[PDB]
């Protein structure tokens, strides 16, 4: 089935929506959507509070579909709604190319190839170029 790993633990919750997006020149992403149950009280009413509090911004998030790796990215932008008795939370997770996108750097790159500029430029996050 579909198993959401966050920070190494398999994190038994209930996903109502999962959508993994992957394009041709863009950072691939993955939206989750969970439901935190409120109407079933007792021991599993605060034990589900412990499982959502582990969703800090920037954690290893892994999705596995039919015992194959689906997404494997870091977490950004945890939104929660809480309308009425509903209390949903929405996750997003971005690839390792998210470490490259909002910090203005400056280099020069004299006497280098087209590939040696760029494979040393993706290497700052741990992304391994294949070419």
């Amino acid at each position: 089935h579909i198993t959401l790993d966050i920070a190494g633990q398999r994190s038994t919750l209930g996903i109502r929506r999962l959508r993994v997006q992957q394009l041709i020149n863009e950072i691939p992403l993955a939206q989750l959507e969970l439901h935190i149950p409120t109407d079933n009280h007792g021991a599993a009413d605060n034990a589900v509070q412990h499982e959502v509090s582990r969703f800090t911004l920037g954690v290893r998030v892994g999705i596995a579909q039919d015992n194959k790796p689906l997404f494997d990215g870091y977490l950004v932008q945890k939104k929660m709604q809480l309308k009425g008795k509903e209390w949903s939370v929405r996750l997003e997770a971005r690839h390792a190319l998210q470490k490259l996108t909002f910090l203005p750097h400056s280099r020069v790159f004299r006497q280098q190839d087209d590939s040696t500029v760029m494979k040393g430029l993706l290497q700052s996050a741990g992304v391994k170029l294949t070419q």
Partner: protein, 223 residues
């Protein structure tokens, strides 16, 4: 019974605010309704998941309890001297929009020995109403009414405050039975509070020494 035999008509008491400080008029209905019904409705929705196969459903809202009752008025039989339009002057008035305030009149219905929703009274506002006059005379002063009231819950905000004070208070004060143990003392203390108190924090609150310092007859408090 137990004192005397005489009819207790139902009374429609109306206020202007939720709490009942400002009183409107009141009327007692002749010809008791012969049937009342209180209808409940709690709305659920089936929760969905794509990981597991556990099947539960989500509590959405609780639609309030509605009271349906019908009344009949008559001013023809020789005991009935008062006209039915001065009696229907207040069912139409107290179950409509107030003149100065936009809200209705909060309509507290009561009967002599009948508990409605675990209380002696039934608060609420009239959702709808219908008078259908079926018999007239020569100038048509009306002679029959056939009223068809229907109400909602609308308890006061204070009454609703005290009822959740008698259920799950702030402090528990659970007892200690014979052959007791802290995993079971914190299991019955977590049933009064409905908040699952741990054995370890129940032990620190009472400052007991050895996790066995209860002596079958002393009281230890949970918070």
């Amino acid at each position: 019974s137990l004192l005397e035999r005489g009819l207790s008509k139902l009374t429609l008491n109306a206020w202007k605010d939720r709490e009942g400080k400002i009183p409107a008029g009141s009327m007692s209905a002749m010809y008791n309704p012969e049937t009342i019904q209180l209808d409940y409705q709690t709305r659920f929705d089936t929760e969905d998941t794509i990981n597991t196969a556990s099947q539960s459903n989500r509590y959405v809202i609780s639609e309030p309890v509605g009271l349906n009752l019908t009344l009949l008025f008559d001013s023809q039989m020789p005991g009935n001297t008062t006209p039915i339009e001065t009696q229907l002057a207040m069912l139409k008035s107290l179950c409509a929009v107030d003149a100065a305030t936009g809200s209705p009149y909060f309509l507290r219905i009561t009967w002599g020995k009948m508990r409605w929703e675990n209380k002696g009274w039934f608060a609420g506002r009239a959702r709808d109403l219908s008078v259908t006059y079926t018999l007239f005379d020569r100038d048509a002063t009306p002679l029959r009414a056939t009223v068809q009231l229907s109400l909602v819950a609308d308890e006061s905000f204070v009454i609703q405050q005290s009822l959740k004070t008698q259920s799950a208070p702030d402090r528990a004060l659970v007892s200690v039975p014979d052959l007791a143990s802290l995993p079971l003392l914190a299991l019955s203390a977590g049933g009064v509070l409905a908040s699952s108190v741990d054995y370890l924090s129940l032990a620190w609150d009472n400052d007991l020494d050895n996790l066995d310092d209860f002596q079958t007859g002393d009281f230890l408090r949970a918070t």
